[PDB]
Amino acid sequence: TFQFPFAEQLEKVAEQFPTFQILNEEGEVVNEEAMPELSDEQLKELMRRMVYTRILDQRSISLNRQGRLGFYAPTAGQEASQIASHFALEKEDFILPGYRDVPQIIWHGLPLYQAFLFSRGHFHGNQIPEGVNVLPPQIIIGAQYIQAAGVALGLKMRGKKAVAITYTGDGGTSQGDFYEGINFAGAFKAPAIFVVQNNRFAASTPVEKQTVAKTLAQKAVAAGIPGIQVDGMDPLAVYAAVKAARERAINGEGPTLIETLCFRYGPHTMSGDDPTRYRSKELENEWAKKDPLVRFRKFLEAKGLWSEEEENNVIEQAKEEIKEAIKKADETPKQKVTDLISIMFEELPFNLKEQYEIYKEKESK
Amino acid sequence: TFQFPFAEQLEKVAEQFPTFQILNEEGEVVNEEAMPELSDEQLKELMRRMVYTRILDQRSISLNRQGRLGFYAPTAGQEASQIASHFALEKEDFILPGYRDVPQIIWHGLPLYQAFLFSRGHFHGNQIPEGVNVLPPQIIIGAQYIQAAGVALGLKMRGKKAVAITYTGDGGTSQGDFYEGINFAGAFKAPAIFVVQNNRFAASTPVEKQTVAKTLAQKAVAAGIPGIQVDGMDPLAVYAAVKAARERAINGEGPTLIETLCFRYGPHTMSGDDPTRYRSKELENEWAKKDPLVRFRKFLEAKGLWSEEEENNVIEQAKEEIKEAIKKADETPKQKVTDLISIMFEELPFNLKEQYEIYKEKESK
Amino acid sequence: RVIAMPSVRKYAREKGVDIRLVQGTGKNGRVLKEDIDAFLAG
Amino acid sequence: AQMTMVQAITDALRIELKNDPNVLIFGEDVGVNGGVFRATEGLQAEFGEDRVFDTPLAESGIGGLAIGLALQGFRPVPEIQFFGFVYEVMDSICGQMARIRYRTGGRYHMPITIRSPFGGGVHTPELHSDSLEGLVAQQPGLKVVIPSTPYDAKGLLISAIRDNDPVIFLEHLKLYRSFRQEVPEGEYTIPIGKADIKREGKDITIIAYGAMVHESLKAAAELEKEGISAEVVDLRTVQPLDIETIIGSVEKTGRAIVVQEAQRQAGIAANVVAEINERAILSLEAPVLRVAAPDTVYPFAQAESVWLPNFKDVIETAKKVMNF
Amino acid sequence: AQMTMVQAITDALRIELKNDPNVLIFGEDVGVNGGVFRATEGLQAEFGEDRVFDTPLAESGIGGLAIGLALQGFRPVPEIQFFGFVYEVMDSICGQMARIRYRTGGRYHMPITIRSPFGGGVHTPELHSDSLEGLVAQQPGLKVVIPSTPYDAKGLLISAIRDNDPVIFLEHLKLYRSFRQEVPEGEYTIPIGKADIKREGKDITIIAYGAMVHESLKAAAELEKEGISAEVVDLRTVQPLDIETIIGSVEKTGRAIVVQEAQRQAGIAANVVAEINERAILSLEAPVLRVAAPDTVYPFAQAESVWLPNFKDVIETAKKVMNF
Ligand SMILES: Cc1ncc(Cc2csc(CCOP(=O)(O)OP(=O)(O)O)c2C)c(N)n1
Ligand SMILES: Cc1ncc(Cc2csc(CCOP(=O)(O)OP(=O)(O)O)c2C)c(N)n1
Ligand SMILES: [K+]
Ligand SMILES: [K+]
Ligand SMILES: [Mg+2]
Ligand SMILES: [Mg+2]
Ligand SMILES: [Mg+2]
DSSP states (O other), X not given: OOOOOHHHHHHHHHHXXXXXXXXXXXXXXXXXXXXXXXXXHHHHHHHHHHHHXXXXXXXXXXXXXXXXXXXXXXXXXXXXXXXXXXXXXXXXXXXXXXXXXXXXXXXXXXXXXXXXXXXXXXXXXXXXXXXXXXXXOBOSTTHXXXXXXXXXXXHHHTTOSOOEEEEEETGGGGSHHHHHHXXXXXXXXXXXXXXXXXXXEETTEETTTTOOOSOSGGGGGGTTSOEEEEETTOHHHHHHHHHHHHHHHHTTOOOEEEEEEOOOSSXXXXXXXXXXXXXXXXXXXXXXXXXXXXXXXXXXXXXXXXXXXXXXXXXXXXXXXXXXXXXXXXXXXXXXXXXXXXXXXXXXXXXXXXXXXXHHHHTTO | OOOOOHHHHHHHHHTTOXXXXXXXXXXXXXXXXXXXXXXXXXXXXXXXXXXXXXXXXXXXXXXXXXTSOOSXXXXXXXXXXXXXXXXXXXXXXXXXXXXXXXXXXXXXXXXXXXXXXXXXXXXXXXXXXXXXXXXXOBXXXXXXXXXXXXXXXXXXXXXXXXXXXXXXXXXXXXXXXXXXXXXXXXHTTOOEEEEEEEOSEETTXXXXXXXXXXXXXXXXXXXXXXXXXXXXXOHHHHHHHHHHHHXXXXXXXXXXXXEEEOOOSSOSOSSTTSTTTOOOSSTTGGGSXXXXXXXXXXXXXXXXXXXXXXXXXXXXXXXXXXXXXXXXXXXXXXXOHHHHHHTTOSSOOHHHHXXXXXXXXXXXX | OXXXXXXXXXXXXXXXXXXXXXXXXXXXXXXXXXXXXXXXXX | OEEOHHHHHHHHHHHHHHHOTTEEEEETTOXXXXXXXXXXXXXXXXXXXXXXXXXXXXXXXXXXXXXXXHHTTOEEEEEOSSGGGGGGSHIIXXXXXXXXXXXXXXXXXXXXXXXXXXXXXXXXOTTSSOOOHHHHTTSTTOEEEOOOSHHHHHHHHHHHHHSSSOXXXXXEGGGSSSOOEEOOSSOOOOOTTOOEEEEOOSSEEEEEOTTHHHHHHHHHHHHHTTTOOEEEEEOSEEESOOHHHHHHHHHHHSOEEEEEEEETTSSSHHHHHHHHHHHHGGGOSSOOEEEEEOSSSSOOGGGHHHHSOOHHHHHHHHHHXXXX | XXXXXXXXHHHHHHHHHHHOTTEEEEETTOSTTOOTTSTTTTHHHHHOTTTEEEOOSOHHXXXXXXXXXXXXXXXXXXXXXXXXXXXXSHIIIIIIITTHHHHTTTSSXXXXXXXXXXXXXXXXXXXXXXXXXXXXXXXXXXXXEOOSSHHHHHHHHHHHHHSSSOEEEEEEGGGSSSOOEEOOSSOOOOOTTOOEEEEXXXXXXXXXXXXXXXXXXXXXXXXXXXXXXXXXXXXXXXXXXXXXXXHHHHHHHSXXXXXEEEETTSSSHHHHHHHHHHHSTTSOSSOOEEEEEOSSSOOOGGGHHHHSOOHHHHHHHHHHHHTX
C-alpha cells in the first residue's frame, strides 16, 4: 500500500529550526560569525540589567510573602530571554507584555513603584507615562498577540521605523489568538516581533501536553513568517535574534517568530503553586548551570570587563531602589469608587453620572 | 550584520509540500505507484456519485431561484474534493461538515429531502437518522474543527476503528478554532482527518490575502502533524490521500491535514446578490479542462468502463430523485413554536413550560 | 398629581371609586388600600 | 435627500472618512466588494485600500487589529459580518476594548465603532439574525446603538464614530432597504443615549427598538382606530438607556409595555421594566408587560413568521395592559 | 461530614466518576496538580488519566472537545480556570452546545457540565473575579447554577452532571473554604431551578445568590435588632428562576430587594425584578430595589472592599424599602 513520507516531512521541517546559540554554558563563544556588535560599555549595561532583574525577582517574592505585593509571577532564570531581547529595542518600539513580562516594561520606561502598584491592584500602576510605549501586562493569554499585529500595522501605516514586540509562554502557543496574531501580521507584512518564551511549563503542564510539534518556533510556518529557535539562557543569542528581527521589520520585510529555550527557577505564581507537584529536582539542578548570569559573567571576566565589586554595587543599588519603590507605592492614595467611574469613559453615560453622585456622597462622610 | 537564512527556510518548507497528483487533465496516470486499489465497480460508482452531485448542484441552484429552496452553497467543481474524499470513509466514520459540505452528509446517509429542509430552514432537516454519523452543516467557520478533535478523541477512547473527518475552506484556515482543532487532535494523537478545500477565494477575498503561507497544507506544521497538498480536481489523488490518512488514524498515529486545490464554477452562495456578485469571466474558462468529471470520464472510457448512455442514466436517476425529495419536503408539516420549544431541553425549565402552554393555546384556536 | 401603588390604584378601579378623590394617609399623600376602604365607608 | 438606512450609513461612513484621516474601515469583504449588503460600496475606490480594506477570515484578529490600531492613534471602524459571529470576538470587545481606558486610567483609549448587522424576517441561515445586543449591554465601557430609521442611523453612526470610546452599532437586516426617508445631506449628529418619540400618545407607552419600532407604529395605528392613543418611544440607544425620556412618557400615560425582537430571557427589556418600576412605580396603573420572543434558540428560517413578535402581539399585549 | 464548599465539590465529582463511567473531567491543570483551588485533587490518582486529564491551553479547544466527546456518548465535565476566560469559549457554549438539541431536533444532546470559579474578596489579578453569569443566563438552552453552601454545592453539582443538557456551574472563590457545613455522605441531588429559604421572614424579601447570600443573612440578623423581619431567598439557580418560590415570598411580605455582586448593568437581578413586577404587582407596597456593584469594570484588587456590595449595603437598601 502506498505510503506518504510523513516522517521525512516532520524531520525535514523541524530541521529548519536549529537552536541558535552564541555563548555556551562555560561562557565560550561558539558562534563568532553571529556575534552581535556590542561595545564594552553595552556589554556591562546588559549584565547590570540582568543582575538587577534577578534581585528584583528575589525582592518581589519576599515582598509578596510579606503581603507588601499582590500578584507576582517570578522571572528568575529568564533574564536573557526578557532583558537581552529588550536590550535590542529602541524607545520608539511598542511593547505588549504578558503577566510575567514586567521587567521588560520597567526598562522601557515604567517606573518601579508603578510596577509594584500593578502587583497590588491600583489603577495608577497602569498609568504609563506619556511617550513610554508599552501596555500594562496582559492577563489574557494570547490577547497581546492579536493586539500586537494591530499596533505593528499602525506603526507601518504612519511610516514609523519601529516595531511592535510581544511576549507569551509555551502554553500560549496553543491559543487561537496566538495563531491569529502571527497570521494577521504576516498577511499585512506588519513590523511585529513575536517572542515565545518556552520555560517548559504552562503552570503545572509540561510542554509536551501542549502540542506534538517538535519545536514551537516552527509554528511560524503556519503563518508563513520566519521562525527562530534560540538558547534562551544566552544573552548574546537572544539579543542577536531580536536585533535581526527588528532590522528586518523596520526595513519593511514583515514579522518574525522567536522561540527562546529558557527556564524559571521560581514557582508559576506566588499564590498556591508548588513546583514539587509536577517537576523533578534532577531537572532543576541542570538548568542551574545554564543560568544566563553564569555564562555571561565568565564571558565578561575573561575580557576583564566585569568583577564582583561592580556586581555587588548593582545588587545594592537594586535593593535601595526597590526600597524606595515599595515605599512610593504605599504612599499612593487609595482608590475611590468615583476614581474608577471617572476613568470609564471620556464623557460619562447617564447611569454612571448618577452612581458618581451616589459615591461622591458616600466618600464625603 | 549577521543574517538568518529565512529565504532558505521558506524554500525548504515549500519542498515538503509538493502537489500530490495521480491523474492529469487528460485522464492520464502521472503517478502509477500511488494508484489506489479500486475495482471497476467502485470506480464506476465514484463517477456515478460525482455526476449525481453535479446534477444536484444544478437543480439546487434552479430550485433556489424558483424559491423552492433557501440557503444554498454551490458545489460544482469540488466533486473530487467532496465526493472522492467521502468515498474513502466507512459507515462508522463521523463527518463534521461545513455549510457547503452537504453532498458528503447525503452520501453518508442523510436523506435528500432532509438536506432540502436544511436549505429551507426546518428542524426536521437536521434530525439525522439514528446510526448515521454526521452533524448538520456548521455555519460558524472553524467550529467544526475543534468539535472534530473532540469526536475523534471519543472514538479513540471507545476503542473504535473509525475517524472523524471535517471540512473547511481556504478562508477558514485563518480562524483560531482551525488552529486549536488541529493542535488538540495532535496533542491527543486523535484519529481526525482535517480537510481544507482551497478554491482561492473566501467569498470576495483571495487566498493571498488570508495568509502569506505559500500552501495551506504547511499549516499542519504548527500542530506538529503531517500535511498533504493534493490536486483537489483529481478524484484518485483525493481518495488516495484520505485513505492514507484514515489508515494512519485508525492505527493510533494521529490526525492529518489535507489541502485540496480546486475551483468552483458557481457563485459563493445563493444569498443575494451573490449569484451575480461578480463574477470572473475568463478566470473560469481555463478551469473547464480541470473539471474532475472530464479527466475521470476519460480515465474510465479508456478502460472501457464508462459511456455517455451510462452517464445519462445517472442524470435521469438524479433528476427523478431530486423531484421526489423536494416534493417530500413540501409535504412535511410546518413548524409550530411548541415544536421548537419541545426540542430545547430533555426536561423543560419553568419558563418554557409556561410559554409552551401559551403557544399551545394559540395553536389550537 | 396623585400617588398610589398599583395594587391600590387597581383596587380603587375595580370598586368604581376614582382614587383621585380620596385622601391618602401615606407618605407624601400616597393613598392606601385603607383610604379607599374609608371611603367605601362614609 | 431620500435615503434608505444602508444609504444613510454609507453616507455617514463617507463623511467620517473625509473628515478624519484616522478613520479606518476593515473586515471580511468590506473593501473591493463593498460588503455583504453594500454598506461600504465605493468607499475603497474613493479613499483607497489604505483606508478601507479586507482582512483574513477571523473575528478575533479583526478585534485585536482594531485595538492595536487605536493604540496607534487611529479611529477604527471594523465590521463583524453578522452579530451572531460576535462569539468569536467577545474578548477583544468585552475583555479588552471596553476596559482599556479604565485599565490604563485614561492613558490609552479606544475610539472604536463596531458595525454589525442582525435581525430576522429575511429567512437567513443559522446565526445570522440572532439578537445578542443584551450581551454587550452588560459590559461597562461600551455603548450599544440600534437605529430604526435612515435619519437615526446616519446621525447616530456619525456620533458613534466621533465618540472616543467603544460603540457597538447594530444594523437590522430587515431595515436596510425596507423604506426611504428624508435625510439631510452633509454631517449632523444625534446624541448617544438619547431616545426620541416616534408617535405622540396619551393612553399607553410603547417602548421599543430595532425593527420592533415599526411594529409598534403599526399597532399604535390600529389601536387608534378604537380610540386607544399609544405613545411609541424608540430607544435608539440601548446602553445607556434614556431614563429621562422613558420615565417622562410613562408618567404621562400611566401605562407601559416594552417590545423587543430578542428572546424574553435575552434583550434589554427586563432592564427597562426594572428601571420603570424603580422610578415610576406609583404612577403605574398596571404592570409593565413585555413583548418578546419565545425562550428558544433563534428559529429555523421557515418558522420566523410564527416565532418573531409582530404588531398583532403588541396590540394584544397593549390591550391587556389597558384592561388590567 | 463537616465539609468546606470545595470539599463538597470534590466529593460530588468523585461520586459521579465512580457511579458513571461516562463522566470525564478535563481542562487546564486539573490532572496531576488537582486544579488551582484543589477542586479536582486526588481524582486523577483514583480514577485514572483517561478520565481526569490536562489539556493544552485553549478554552475554545476545551469547549469543542467537550462537544465532540458528548457526541460519542461521554458525559463531559470540563473546567474553565476562571470564568473571566469565558470570552475565549463563548461560541462553544452559546453558539454550539446550548443549541445542539434544538439544532438537531433531539437527535443529539449535550450532557455537559462546565465548572468555573468567580467572585471577589480575595485580591485576584484582572479578569479572575468578574461576575459574568448574566451573559450565559441570556442564552436559551443553558442552565446556570451558583451554590452558596457546601450542602447546596454537592447536591446541585450532582444534579448538574446528571442533567442531559448543558449546565454552567459557577463556584465562588470566597466561598470555597469560607466555612464548614454538615454535608451528607453518598449521592443526593437538589433540583435545578429550585430556590430555598435561608431565613424565614415576614416584613421583607431579600433575594440573592452566590456570596451575596451570606451578606444577606448577615444583614437580616442585624435588621432583626431593628424590628425588621427579613426573609432570605437563595435562588441557587439563576437560570431558570424559581418563580413559584420567589413570588410566594413576595406575596407574603409585599416588599422585596434583589442583591447581586455583579455590576448593576450586569447580573440577573433586573430579570428577577421584572418577573416580580409582573406576577405580583398587586402584592407590592414598595418598589423592588436592587443592591449591585457600580457600573465600572471589575475593580483593581485594592479597591475591592469599597466597590463590592456587602451586608451594610443590604441593610441600607432594605430599610429604604421598608420606609418607603
Ligand atoms: C486565556 C487565559 N487562560 C488561562 C489563564 C490562566 C493562566 C495564567 S498563567 C497560565 C500558564 C501559562 O503558561 P505559559 O507557558 O503560557 O506562560 P508562563 O506562565 O510564562 O510559563 C495559565 C493557564 C489566563 N491567564 N488566560
Ligand atoms: C465565523 C464566521 N465568520 C464569517 C462567516 C461568513 C462567511 C460565510 S462564507 C464565508 C467565506 C468563507 O470562505 P472559505 O474559503 O473559508 O469557504 P468557501 O465558502 O468553501 O469558499 C464567510 C466569511 C461565517 N460563516 N462564520
Ligand atoms: K467610537
Ligand atoms: K449537564
Ligand atoms: Mg511556560
Ligand atoms: Mg478564538
Ligand atoms: Mg474558498
